[PDB]
Amino acid sequence: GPHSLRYFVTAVSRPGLGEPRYMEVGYVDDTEFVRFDSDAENPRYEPRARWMEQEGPEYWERETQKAKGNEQSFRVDLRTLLGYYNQSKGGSHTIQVISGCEVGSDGRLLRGYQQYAYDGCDYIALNEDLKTWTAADMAALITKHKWEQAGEAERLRAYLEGTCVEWLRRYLKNGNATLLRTDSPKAHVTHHSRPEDKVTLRCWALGFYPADITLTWQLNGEELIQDMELVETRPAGDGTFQKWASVVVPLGKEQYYTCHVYHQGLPEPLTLRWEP
Template sequence: MEPLKLSFLLMAVALPEIKAGVHSLRYFQTSMSQPGLTKPRFISVGYVDDQAFVRFDSDSAGLREEPMVMWLDKSNQNYWERNSRVIWETARTFQVGLQNLQFYYNQSEGAHTYQRLVGCEVTYDWIFLRGFEQFAYNGHDYISLDLTTLSWTVAEPTALNSKLKWEAERSIAQRQKEYLEEKCVYWLRKYLEYGKEKLLRAAPPSVRITHRTHPDGKVTLQCRSQDFYPAEISLTWLRDGEEQHQDTEFIETRPAGDGTFQKWVAVEVTSGQEGNYICRVQHEGLPEPLTLKWEPESSSPWIIVGVLAAVFLLNAVIAGAVVWRKKTSGGKGGDYVQAAGNDSAQGSDVSLTAKA
């Protein structure tokens, strides 16, 4: 199972960023069948904005949803009972869904994955932006929910089997619309209140510029930013005041593993022209954009921006996520199984999935 764990780590690094001015609640859920397993393994990870805050692994000893952050201790025992029950129901529907998908694709038993991304986004002043529910099979987009038409959009022909089944019962899409527009937003607001000291903080970046000369005489200047939160940041190279897009290289913003983020952008310049280049950094934690250039005489390569608060170390790297990456509008579908009990908007924050 070690290769499986490694893939989850790589997927966690590649999680899509949340746009500036937006809060989100998202769940990534994956069911995996492998030769030798009596039943598929199911993993679910919840995110508030960029922070993983809950997880569930059907292979864990506790068989319950577990917190990944300290601020969830404010939630009571009934909350964990309800959420664990809904997660287990979802795991069972995923197991049936995997069997159905293998039948649709005329595949034998073996290693297969059935995945779901579900969640909502709101503006900072609580205007609902969108809800999304997307499914994938074996790493490829399968089907998604269109909230406007309450219909299911197929990503490839085989998904017509699920589309016809789910659209025959219109209440499936309607129930999910209610979850995304009401319950999901309700719980997102509660989580942001619970974790406001971590989730609503603005930690400014620490920035440095490094200089590397290549054998051919070309020079690479790298502007590296780290220790910042939230993840939204802009790093731009300017030459004589104009933004440089050619001869530049960058990495997407990625988690640093301690609750903060890091990013860098590099530009190739002609030796002796380094002084014409400026790195501009824009971030919520900065009172105004920061501009700096490479200073060869500087004794310290780091420029510390602001006073950083004590960093809360994450307990674990994300255990599960999606192998596919989608543009952010999407959905899923299926024959939904009702959860035991009556979950109101104040009940579980997790929506049930469906059998494909």
């Protein structure tokens, strides 16, 4: 299938309490592989997956210096954006960026992206063409114009088509036994009483990688998406994921409901019911 290299970066001011906190977290398909955090005892880029330990000290020193440079850059940005928005120096504010690329199974670029947010709202973003920017407001129009004079977009484009994709392939190769694996979901059903002669059936899926999964409830063959509680798929602390979907059904009728679990790790979708 396709794969992706993604960085989530945040800088958040805290007036009165020193310099902004700056964080970079990197992912290859749903697994955390690197991290920078300005509040660490010693702020350096560090591995977050065992396969990255193979990268030598030149990798770690380069990425560390890049991250410290990015930190100062975002510190300036925070000051700048107080000016654009006519805001005071006493409040805390947040810049977020998502930056990365996806390649298809042939190892070629499918899409690149770089989007920024300020205080939780769209700010500026590179378009799919990798040539122009969409500014969400007029503060961001100032940025758009600065970035257009500086050739920022072809600079970014060159990273996305060049460095980003080339490092993704490297990571997928060096970490293939972790990244290219599939852990199949193991599933079960729990049962809970409700008032009014009804019952919650909850279908659980545990232990799976990658994160993409689909849980449905059925009755005769109709999917009951119209009466389903669920949680977003979530990490379980060891590089695998979990999910549940529930449905409310009449007491004594729970044997006609089936949970179905769809995952790329499974040779065929799982089917199960409540076990009394």
